[PDB]
Amino acid sequence: MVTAITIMALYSIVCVVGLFGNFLVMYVIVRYTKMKTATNIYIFNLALADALATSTLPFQSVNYLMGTWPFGNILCKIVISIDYYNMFTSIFTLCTMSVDRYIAVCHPVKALDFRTPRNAKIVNVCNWILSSAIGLPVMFMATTKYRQGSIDCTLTFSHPTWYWENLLKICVFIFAFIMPVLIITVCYGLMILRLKSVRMLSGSKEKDRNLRRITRMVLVVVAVFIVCWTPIHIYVIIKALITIPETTFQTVSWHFCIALGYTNSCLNPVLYAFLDENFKRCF
């Protein structure tokens, strides 16, 4: 009972942080920024993906509460699709912001040709479609199964089961953890190596403070992403290789890893909007 209520409370706080942070970002964008800048467009996309991902949570919390699905087949499908789709969109929006900053720093001449709000909208739509390429198969492929005393949201298993399960898990691991980590690490490393040569940063003590501040945001963003997404993926891979007995410690660790994965999206508005110097000028 204590473990269940701990999970519920932590989950509820995560939901709250996700909903209010993202909605505040929405209100600020729609009242002050006026959606006229590429970075504001990217922040809006990130906030939308994070908001929907966090809105996926209460259905899962209720499901684990009763051990059953009370919402029906149609809801089961839309919730599963929203979860997968919005995880992918949030990760891809993080990658796109990283690449946008890399282009704005390391390729300044071409950023004149590329970094326009129309191109930001085009790449946002392209990312949404690319994530739909996995949201729709699981939308049509999610199903509701009946057990002796429980209702569970699962996925239909086209024969064989093992090949399909491995393919899905490997695809999610590669295109949701390995690729974003590599992209953001390479882009931010090159961007820092370029920013070390900017004369307005390698100057007086104030300029050195500015450079250290920029490096601090870059490194803290990378570290937050890595610490928020590595444990859950590692743990689900470990579970898939060796079966894990169901105990209190295993359950609490599993739910903490899930909560950490969602706190990634909860923290994203703090790192990308509130610490954004454009937002600080908005009074």
Partner: peptide, 4 residues
């Protein structure tokens, strides 16, 4: 992310 995984379903429970």
């Amino acid at each position: 992310y995984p379903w429970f």
